[PDB]
Design a protein around this motif. Sequence first.
Motif: not given
Lengths: 760, 760
Positions: B32, B34-36, B185-188
């Motif tokens: 997860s 990695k997406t951020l 992952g919670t962050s935008t």
Amino acid sequence: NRIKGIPKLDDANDAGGRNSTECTLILTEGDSAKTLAVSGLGVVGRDKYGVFPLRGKILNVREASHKQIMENAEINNIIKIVGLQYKKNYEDEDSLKTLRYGKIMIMTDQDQDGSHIKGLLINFIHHNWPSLLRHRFLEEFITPIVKVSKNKQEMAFYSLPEFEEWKSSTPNHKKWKVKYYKGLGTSTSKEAKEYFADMKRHRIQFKYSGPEDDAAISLAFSKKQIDDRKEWLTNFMEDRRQRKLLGLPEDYLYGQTTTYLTYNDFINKELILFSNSDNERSIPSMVDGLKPGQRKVLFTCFKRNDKREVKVAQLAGSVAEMSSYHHGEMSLMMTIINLAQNFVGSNNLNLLQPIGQFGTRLHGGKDSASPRYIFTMLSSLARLLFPPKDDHTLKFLYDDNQRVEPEWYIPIIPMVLINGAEGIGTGWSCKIPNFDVREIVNNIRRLMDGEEPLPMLPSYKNFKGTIEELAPNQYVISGEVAILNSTTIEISELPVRTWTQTYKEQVLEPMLNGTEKTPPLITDYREYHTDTTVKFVVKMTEEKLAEAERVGLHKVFKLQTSLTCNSMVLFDHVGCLKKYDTVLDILRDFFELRLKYYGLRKEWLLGMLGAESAKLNNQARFILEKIDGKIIIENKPKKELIKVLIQRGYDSDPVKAWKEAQQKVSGPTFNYLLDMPLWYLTKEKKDELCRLRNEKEQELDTLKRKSPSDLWKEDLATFIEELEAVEAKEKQDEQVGLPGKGGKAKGKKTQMAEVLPSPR
Amino acid sequence: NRIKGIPKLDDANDAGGRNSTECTLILTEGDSAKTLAVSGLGVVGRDKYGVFPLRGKILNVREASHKQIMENAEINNIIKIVGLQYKKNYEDEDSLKTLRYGKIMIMTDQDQDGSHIKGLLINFIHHNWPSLLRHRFLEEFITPIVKVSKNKQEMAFYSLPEFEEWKSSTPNHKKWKVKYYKGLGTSTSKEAKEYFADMKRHRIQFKYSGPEDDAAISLAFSKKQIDDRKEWLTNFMEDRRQRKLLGLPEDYLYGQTTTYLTYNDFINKELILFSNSDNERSIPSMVDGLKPGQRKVLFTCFKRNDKREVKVAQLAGSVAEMSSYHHGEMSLMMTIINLAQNFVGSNNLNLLQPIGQFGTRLHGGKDSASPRYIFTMLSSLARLLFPPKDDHTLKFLYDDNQRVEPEWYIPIIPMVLINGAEGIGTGWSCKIPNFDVREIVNNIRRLMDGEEPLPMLPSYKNFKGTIEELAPNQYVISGEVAILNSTTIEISELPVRTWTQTYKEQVLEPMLNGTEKTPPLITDYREYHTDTTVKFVVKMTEEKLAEAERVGLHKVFKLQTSLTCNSMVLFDHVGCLKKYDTVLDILRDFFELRLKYYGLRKEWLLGMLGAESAKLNNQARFILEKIDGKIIIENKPKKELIKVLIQRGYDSDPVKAWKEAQQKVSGPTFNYLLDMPLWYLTKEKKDELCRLRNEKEQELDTLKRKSPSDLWKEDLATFIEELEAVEAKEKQDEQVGLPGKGGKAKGKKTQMAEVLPSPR
DNA sequence: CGCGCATCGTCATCCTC
DNA sequence: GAGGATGACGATG
DNA sequence: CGCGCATCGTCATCCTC
DNA sequence: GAGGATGACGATG
Ligand SMILES: COc1cc([C@@H]2c3cc4c(cc3[C@@H](O[C@@H]3O[C@@H]5CO[C@@H](C)O[C@H]5[C@H](O)[C@H]3O)[C@H]3COC(=O)[C@H]23)OCO4)cc(OC)c1O
Ligand SMILES: COc1cc([C@@H]2c3cc4c(cc3[C@@H](O[C@@H]3O[C@@H]5CO[C@@H](C)O[C@H]5[C@H](O)[C@H]3O)[C@H]3COC(=O)[C@H]23)OCO4)cc(OC)c1O
């Protein structure tokens, strides 16, 4: 001989030895049913029974490559356990004796999916061993789907039509405790012992007679008989509709004792139910533009207010709690995520706000975080598209004796044309691209007056590529390319339905190095990627650049992508299917269906507001009479008090009256006139009650005065006013991200079209 | 040079080429993050930054076999990406230049688990390259854990002690909207851009000084320094207790700007928090005999009544909704299943009824069905062990500003001694076998009078094997074997902590065929298995049978199994740890802790019942005065009415008074005297109110009269009366299963003990 | 939790001819 | 009798 | 959903000596 | 210009 290769196999005692003609083998779906089978075999034994768990949907073999047949290991294990051979005919009983097992008993869930798996297995056996289907080789084990319980008594039921018949034909209903069974794991050890005790009721043998059944098997899995399946489902749907209209209860199976079962009845009564269910759950509706999985989540979200945010895992749990979802939370979390993505190409409008990371435009949207990492909340546009005063209009269901979600919804826009529709079913499939919301609003406003609608074009939100229309229902999309210098080149935007990682691995990698027959075309490539926009800088040879210009840059880098519209298949307000041709047809149909409900909403809100006003008037009159001192409740019997109240003119609860009038398709009632606390006996509250009833009278007068139409116009105006703020926030989201100082390459842009339409 | 082996790697531009000394590499936990990282790199670039996702807990290399080191592929990928070599010293800067990456920045969650992973990585780097820790090679990226929001204003917080300090030092608290962050992952996207914009605050470099830090790293991962870790945690726990008692707020990190971070402070302030948390979540308590994961589920089940059954998936969702669980539903479903198993060897008593298949005694209990296949419901013994009148006695927490579960519970039996306790922690571990409930009840009844308790022996429910005690805290368990004929042999029961599939694969398979040095001992084996009992029939050679008899059948077939009790480590009523020695010590401690609370329960129920009776008396007096006609509320101001009521003697809500008296550690209040509807103004209800207040007076008198003790005796009597029905149903469950006609082999039984105690 | 492989109808390319 | 090796278990990656 | 592999402290055997 | 091959997608095994 013995078997020691796979550990999951539970071999029997006489498997492969003597008396193998009686040694059976149990095939169960998944792995949970293995627990039930092993727990049950404690009573029968271990000599003539063996259990081997499967994995899921078995590969179809009637049309598949031999390499793909060799790739699957589960089929190899099945042959290795049984002992079959591909080109070995089995005609004499000695050939059957050669095998290590006598019979094969399949057992799965009592739902449509188990029926599909059984059909796949029958097809697999028939495709390569036609002779084995005439020696009593295959058999089925069945389980109950629902049970009742009252005073140490139970009644088994295997089919829903039988349960419906028992409900309709027997009095004293609902005294028994209903208990639905969905998975085989739900049963306990006692139930398994009772099931295997009554072998003469569950174990069912098959039977073959007549070559026509062979065609029937082909009719189920022939890649060249698509039209045949289309007619076969259409006839069944028409028959079901006619039977429902005539009210005659349809036939079912598994009711009384069954010694055998014909293949023709097996296919024309059970697998067709799976086909109908799959078409129902995999094709959107023209009314709400949603699917039942999406509909359940959208209803569960409507039930609570949810002013704050909420976790996705607890949200799925609540959906399974109230929406009666029975397909696994894992398959539901992906749907919840799909109902929230808002990146380029996914959805022009979303219903759940994107709090967290719901997947970027790089890894196919599958790069989303764990469901417990992300949060969600209803968007401001959700309650605006669906007015709160429409719950009374639609019809609901009563799955599991529970008020559940309706069959569709009535939005103020055609949802099929705003978020697309892509689904694969049985006999029919659906593919509807996206469009622009403002064009839809303009067309609806133009049609409401009476003018003619205008032709539209499939558009997308946050997209800069060009779209060209050459043939009806056909479109071409081109990206963005520029020439920075005589040597370099820039790619700014890729077309929709294209992923950056996939496009890179499938274009830049083959072009970087020389292939088997082509020299390395490109020399250098660099990536300037962002969350929304992409930027590729490619350095190449000037002669190669001139060659690509002579040939066409779009063709060289695969920028022009074609799309067609020939799968316009959706449901109807009744439930039938139609093959739509033009978007304007869908727009006119939605317009008429929406126009039919203004009268229904007006007639519902009217009368209901009047009854609420009448109830308030009766309460005020009772309070005034009590202040006057005529009504005496000091030490008066409850019964005599009701009698004296009735002689006044006081009536029952009008809300109960409307509820009864709606339900049409213990005496007097005066509880609400006495459920008011003593606080209501002061002028400070009497004034508030008077002003409230005056406000209700004014609202009723305005409703009686206003037109049945013109509410649509006010709702559209409010929706546009909200969409303005929504798009402003969406643009501000990028404007805060806007770095300012960054590489900003600018170059002449080449825009091109196919020279030949090549129309079919 | 380029890298093309693993697709998950996102290589940078100058990786491996020139200026590699500045090319960094980002290591993230899971997938997860990695997406951020990718979403964030859009702003910085792709030249000096590369992202490679990890999998989870990295293998420790300080003490592991070289073969196991070669087995892991993730470490091989890490070396292949970086370019390290095992026996290559890195002293000169040219050796660092040889590598393809300059620095390594690790980023994980801001919790204890990320700290553990970072420690594991530091150990991995130091164990084989000590010289690299003095050249600024490793660095850390941090993120906020909680944010506030009020009027376009926010304040970041990285540590809970800093958030607690901000709460204690700032007025106008709670106006800001709190928002906890658990996963990256919670962050935008906006938050990621803001994080990478302020590089001078998140990016933190390490620093090494002094060889002592090396020992500190050993102090964290030395398999020969267990006692050192024990002292290191004991000192920290004592210091924390003393600081909490003195009320001085403890120190934290990451508060102001940090250019560097010493390893000594890195270990003695962050990893020790992970060790303390792990010990807290992996060791049961002597009071309730449960763990926080079990406690949250048991509290959530207590919140609702749940008269009917409930699905496990929705139950876990509700637990995460209310119990504030933040460790993944997948890790929680296994705990819920563990709290319901009742087969032989699992639990002598269960709290959740087994509806479905919760795993048999064949495949290690891991053969349970899908969580959506099974149902569950609270057992009749749950509410009896925990009286409903004990919620007021215990103290709760306020995680996430929410009334949450308490720290322990007060049952009527020591739960540690009834369901066992097996856990592995840090510096300490726990292993407590099961016992019999009737012996515990007899011992408690004997101790309550004042007599001396009796020595007990670890027993199990539904077990027929023999148990022998040779040394204190040591026991031996033997199964059941019989000789049917001069050739055959029968195995009836296996000892606890033994699984049929595992025992078969590890004993029957090696004995069936000849091993490398032993001839095939057994000849034939057959299985007669059931859900609860097992039956093995083995045919062998008569001479081999005589040889096994001379040697001992238990030794040949591995029936005698030893167990010890030296890990009696549990928490305390305060929170400290103790190394218990005897079971009677736990029994006496539980007895005293329970005895301390009778006075508290009596004092709470007393006064509270009196206040409820007083409130009922005040309501009755108000109704009587209103019937008399003294109190006039026709058209009287709300304020003047309160004033005239006060002069009567009428007081506020006593329930509010008790709530205030409990909370100690807008004017008058007369709402309840006017919230009664008009139905209360009839004699038919006045009589019911009078009888109800008389009943409350009688109950208060009985409470004042009865002893503070003797409630324990009544509760034990009720518990035994219920256990009689529970065991009757449990036996009937087998009695219905009882087939009747079945193979029933009977033979002489050999019972044997070790000739030599061999006491240590 | 990540990759593991399956259905089912249309179709845009993709590799031969 | 005397030493090294190793998997067993449970909440979480 | 199944198998995929990891920590962490005690210890019962298990293979040499 | 003319034919066979194949993966792409989404709710569920
Ligand atoms: C292994 O044991 C069983 C498996 C199943 C299937 C299944 C079957 C598979 C398989 C995977 C799956 C898996 O689906 C996968 O979920 C993934 C969830 O994350 C997203 C990203 O990607 C999804 C995959 O697109 C999907 O394919 C299961 C989820 O729930 C099911 O019903 C699925 O790969 C190999 O064959 C059913 C059973 O009995 C009923 C079993 O015993
Ligand atoms: C793959 O991607 C990630 C994995 C993880 C780990 C994990 C890691 C594994 C691994 C498995 C697992 C798995 O645990 C398994 O669950 C199973 C559930 O059924 C029961 C029967 O048996 C359990 C296994 O005993 C347990 O080991 C994950 C469950 O949730 C986690 O936190 C676990 O096998 C290989 O390494 C964390 C991540 O990021 C934070 C990831 O990105």
